[PDB]
């Protein structure tokens, strides 16, 4: 019936005066847009059908055409920013928001999905959806005693669309919108569905990427413990966004960082630091680099969980990007750490692998590493163990590289090297 219509026919039918003829034509448009391969989005837009669809959204007496056009408009909004713009331009936002209160859960869901695609386009549309007052209607849909009574897929759609209202940074979602969503987001962060969980985390990770005031909004809701737990999830789809949230929160104040340590996060790192998925490993080392940039009592917490060996490990063998984060972790550690701690760092075998990394084609890492060595000597002086450290670097051939990095096209490399030799190898 409605399978494989030509756009000329769909146009023909939507232009007829027959509500039914229009419905069948609209369902045909929906199917064109739902075929697994290259949907004629541009031709549909080009035919000028969006205003008609947006218009069918309001036909309360014909729920079917409401659903069909909703789906159709949802898929158009799924494309490029321009295509999504086309839908927004047609007056669809206020209309889709209206459908959230529909008696037909499947039409409400569609409304939720469409608003999801629109806000997902970026800051602007995100904030335009918010100005049309979509948060209230959305949040109302989840106001039930037990989330479990809701349809699995229905609940996932809401969690997803909500995550997009928390997405993007320039600018970040309005403050009071985050405040209005958070209580519901926290509740979803405790649901038993892997998807609701992964998306909830993503949402939380978004709200925690930016100024510390933003992080505080989240941390103050007591979700760190729950994040640390999801951090130990079996499913990569959950662990990835969770590790990210945890990683952002520790880019803030040391008090906020302390929350994750207290939460028990550190215990999950021996795993994360040897994780098969390289990206989890990169994110974990990065997270560690911000923990070693904290207080000494916090650096000790790292030491206590036998994590220094794990860093020595990452520094020794890993994707280069993970090593760069490892180099940072170490250089931050040797930056604010106590002598005794910088001592331990060496007894863990950090020197050799740190040196082999001076053989990298990355000028910034060489600065990070060299900078680290300096911090170690600086602590070796307070002990007078300066020569022992000198020899050590020579044993593994580190001197045979610093002594070469004086003749390096960079300024810091050039100088930091020369100074190192000059001051510790003469």
């Amino acid at each position: 019936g409605t399978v494989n219509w030509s756009v000329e026919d769909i146009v023909k039918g939507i232009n007829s005066n027959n509500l039914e003829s229009q419905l069948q034509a609209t369902q045909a448009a929906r199917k064109l847009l739902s075929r697994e391969k290259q949907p004629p989005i541009d031709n549909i837009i080009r035919a000028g059908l969006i205003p008609k669809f947006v218009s069918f959204l309001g036909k309360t007496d014909c729920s079917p055409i409401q659903f069909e056009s909703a789906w159709a408009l949802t898929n158009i909004a799924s494309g490029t920013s321009e295509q999504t713009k086309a839908v927004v331009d047609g007056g669809a936002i206020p209309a889709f928001i209206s459908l959230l209160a529909s008696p037909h859960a499947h039409i409400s869901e569609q409304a939720v999905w469409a608003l999801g695609n629109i806000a997902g386009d970026g800051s602007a549309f995100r904030d335009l959806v918010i100005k049309h007052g979509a948060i209230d209607p959305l949040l109302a849909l989840l106001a039930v005693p037990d989330l479990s009574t809701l349809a699995c897929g229905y609940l996932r759609n809401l969690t997803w669309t909500l995550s997009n209202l928390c997405r993007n940074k320039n600018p970040a979602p309005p403050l009071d919108a985050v405040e209005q969503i958070l209580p519901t987001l926290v509740r979803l962060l405790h649901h038993n569905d892997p998807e609701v969980l992964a998306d909830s985390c993503w949402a939380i990770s978004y709200l925690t990427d930016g100024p510390n005031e933003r992080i505080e909004m989240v941390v103050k809701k007591g979700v760190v413990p729950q994040l640390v737990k999801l951090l130990g999830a079996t499913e990569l789809p959950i662990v990835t966004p969770a590790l990210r949230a945890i990683g952002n929160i520790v880019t803030g104040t040391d008090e906020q960082t302390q929350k994750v340590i207290d939460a028990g996060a550190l215990a999950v790192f021996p795993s994360l630091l040897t994780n098969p998925k390289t990206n989890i490993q990169k994110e974990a080392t990065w997270t560690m680099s911000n923990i070693t940039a904290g207080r000494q009592d916090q650096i000790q917490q790292v030491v206590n969980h036998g994590l220094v060996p794990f860093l020595v490990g990452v520094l020794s063998k890993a994707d280069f990007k993970t090593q760069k984060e490892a180099a940072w972790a170490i250089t931050n550690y040797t930056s604010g750490g106590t002598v005794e701690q910088i001592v331990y760092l060496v007894h863990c075998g950090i020197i050799e692998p740190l040196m082999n990394l001076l053989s990298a084609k990355d000028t910034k890492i060489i600065q990070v590493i060299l900078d680290a060595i300096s911090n170690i000597f600086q602590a070796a002086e307070k002990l007078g163990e300066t020569e022992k450290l000198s020899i050590m670097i020579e044993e593994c051939g580190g001197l045979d590289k610093i002594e070469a990095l004086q003749r390096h096209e960079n300024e810091s490399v050039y100088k930091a090297s020369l100074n190192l030799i000059e001051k510790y190898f003469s």
């Binding site: 990427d209 952002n248 520790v250 880019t251 680099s289 911000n290 940039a293 940072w328 931050n332 930056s335």
Partner: peptide, 7 residues
């Protein structure tokens, strides 16, 4: 600020 928000 050593804490690098490598974002």
């Amino acid at each position: 600020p050593k804490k690098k928000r490598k974002v």
